[PDB]
């Protein structure tokens, strides 16, 4: 197996847990303890490669430590998640990218921008806005629904592809 260490980041309530559990366990959790942080492992084939995905679903308080810095820099690629009905979560993306670039000490870290909850009727964050930000960082952008499972496999598999590209 090729191992890939993925970290899922973004504001409380954007659906980091629901995206992870949809990929790992194939069901939608309506309630998942917002404070619970953990890593989940999944064997999957991506473009014919047998991959062991090790996925950190981030949680807890805004706390900076040498320990947390160390845990975060073991990530090889980052899923940067906002909700399409949460303007603040979209505005917070830059902050998360800056903390990733800081602990990785690099301007090129594999990353995918994810707009989650695309099943929801009214959006406050337009696809074009998110596309614009993705093009600026030079990363892929995908809209997902942890609820319907739309885009979920594609989001994680696209991040693995970015990590492969980075390896060259
Ligand atoms: C996240 C993250 C994170 C990385 F992506 C990379 C390296 C990190 C190193 C660290 O020591 C700490 C973090 C980290 N951990 C938690 C974090 C955390 N919490 C509270 C909300 C939910 C959570 C799961 O994101 C955990 N929250 C934030 O920023 C939240 C905002 C909202 C209030 C003001 N904060 C600053 C901000 C902006 F836009 F300026 C967004 N950062 C965290 C962080 F950088 C790193
Ligand atoms: N409608 C809808 N609700 C979602 C989606 N993803 C997550 N949720 C809900 O949004 C809330 C927060 O999700 P959670 O995964 O706990 O967010 P986290 O704090 O980022 O882990 C929960 O009530 C979830 O059921 C989605 O794609 N569509
Ligand atoms: Mg969660």
Curated annotation (Swiss-Prot):
Which Gene Ontology terms of cellular component type are present? cytoplasm; cytoplasmic side of plasma membrane; cytosol; endoplasmic reticulum membrane; focal adhesion; Golgi membrane; membrane; mitochondrial outer membrane
The entry's keywords: Acetylation, Cardiomyopathy, Cell membrane, Cytoplasm, Deafness, Disease variant, Ectodermal dysplasia, Glycoprotein, GTP-binding, Hydrolase, Intellectual disability, Isopeptide bond, Lipoprotein, Membrane, Methylation, Nucleotide-binding, Palmitate, Prenylation, Proto-oncogene, Ubl conjugation
Q: Where on the chain is N-acetylthreonine found, per UniProt?
A: 2
Phenotype for residue 5 to N: In GASC; found also in a patient with Costello syndrome; exhibits only minor alterations in its in vitro biochemical behavior compared to wild-type protein
The entry's stated outcome for residue 13 to D is: In GASC, JMML and OES; also found in a breast carcinoma cell line; somatic mutation
Q: Name one GO biological process term.
A: myoblast proliferation
Q: Which Gene3D superfamilies match?
A: P-loop containing nucleotide triphosphate hydrolases
The annotated consequence of residue 40 to A reads: Decreased interaction with MAPKAP1/SIN1
Where does the record place the modification N-acetylmethionine? 1
EC category: hydrolase
- Motif Effector region boundaries: 32-40
Where, in this chain's numbering, is GTP bound? 10-18, 29-35, 59-60, 116-119
Question: Among its keywords, does the record have Cytoplasm?
Answer: yes
Question: What reaction(s) does this enzyme catalyze?
Answer: GTP + H2O = GDP + phosphate + H(+)
Q: How is it modified after translation?
A: Acetylation at Lys-104 prevents interaction with guanine nucleotide exchange factors (GEFs). Lysine-depalmitoylation by SIRT2 promotes its localization to endomembranes in endocytic pathways.
**Effect the entry attributes to changing residue 61 to L:** Promotes GTP binding
The subcellular localization recorded is: Cell membrane; Endomembrane system; Cytoplasm, Cytosol
SUPFAM superfamilies this protein is in?
A: P-loop containing nucleoside triphosphate hydrolases (SSF52540)
N6-acetyllysine found at: 104
Q: Which family does it belong to?
A: Belongs to the small GTPase superfamily. Ras family.
Q: How does it assemble?
A: Interacts with PHLPP. Interacts (active GTP-bound form preferentially) with RGS14. Interacts (when farnesylated) with PDE6D; this promotes dissociation from the cell membrane. Interacts with SOS1. Interacts (when farnesylated) with GPR31. Interacts with RAP1GDS1. Interacts (active GTP-bound form) with both SHOC2 and PP1c (all isoforms) to form a tertiary complex; SHOC2 and PP1c preferably bind M-Ras/MRAS, but they also bind K-Ras/KRAS, N-Ras/NRAS and H-Ras/HRAS. Interacts (GTP-bound form) with MAPKAP1/SIN1; inhibiting K-Ras/KRAS activity.
Identify the disorder associated with this protein.
Leukemia, acute myelogenous: A subtype of acute leukemia, a cancer of the white blood cells. AML is a malignant disease of bone marrow characterized by maturational arrest of hematopoietic precursors at an early stage of development. Clonal expansion of myeloid blasts occurs in bone marrow, blood, and other tissue. Myelogenous leukemias develop from changes in cells that normally produce neutrophils, basophils, eosinophils and monocytes. Leukemia, juvenile myelomonocytic: An aggressive pediatric myelodysplastic syndrome/myeloproliferative disorder characterized by malignant transformation in the hematopoietic stem cell compartment with proliferation of differentiated progeny. Patients have splenomegaly, enlarged lymph nodes, rashes, and hemorrhages.
Tell me, in a sentence or two, what this protein's role is.
Answer: Ras proteins bind GDP/GTP and possess intrinsic GTPase activity. Plays an important role in the regulation of cell proliferation. Plays a role in promoting oncogenic events by inducing transcriptional silencing of tumor suppressor genes (TSGs) in colorectal cancer (CRC) cells in a ZNF304-dependent manner.
Protein name, as recorded = GTPase KRas
Q: Which organism is it from?
A: Homo sapiens (Human)
């Amino acid at each position: 197996m090729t191992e890939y260490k993925l970290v899922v980041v973004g504001a409380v309530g954007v659906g980091k847990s629901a995206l992870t559990i949809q990929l790992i366990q194939n069901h939608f959790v309506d309630e998942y303890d917002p404070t619970i942080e953990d890593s989940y492992r999944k064997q999957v084939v991506i473009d014919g490669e047998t991959c062991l995905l090790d996925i950190l679903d981030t949680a807890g308080q805004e706390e900076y430590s040498a320990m947390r810095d160390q845990y975060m820099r073991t990530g090889e690629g980052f899923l940067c998640v906002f909700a399409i009905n949460n303007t603040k979560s979209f505005e917070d993306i830059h902050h998360y990218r800056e903390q990733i670039k800081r602990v990785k000490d690099s301007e090129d870290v594999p990353m995918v921008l994810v707009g989650n909850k695309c099943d929801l009727p009214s959006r406050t964050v337009d696809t074009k806005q998110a596309q614009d930000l993705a093009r600026s960082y030079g990363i892929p952008f995908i809209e997902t629904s942890a609820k319907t499972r739309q885009g979920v496999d594609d989001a994680f598999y696209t991040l693995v592809r970015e990590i492969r590209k980075h390896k060259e």
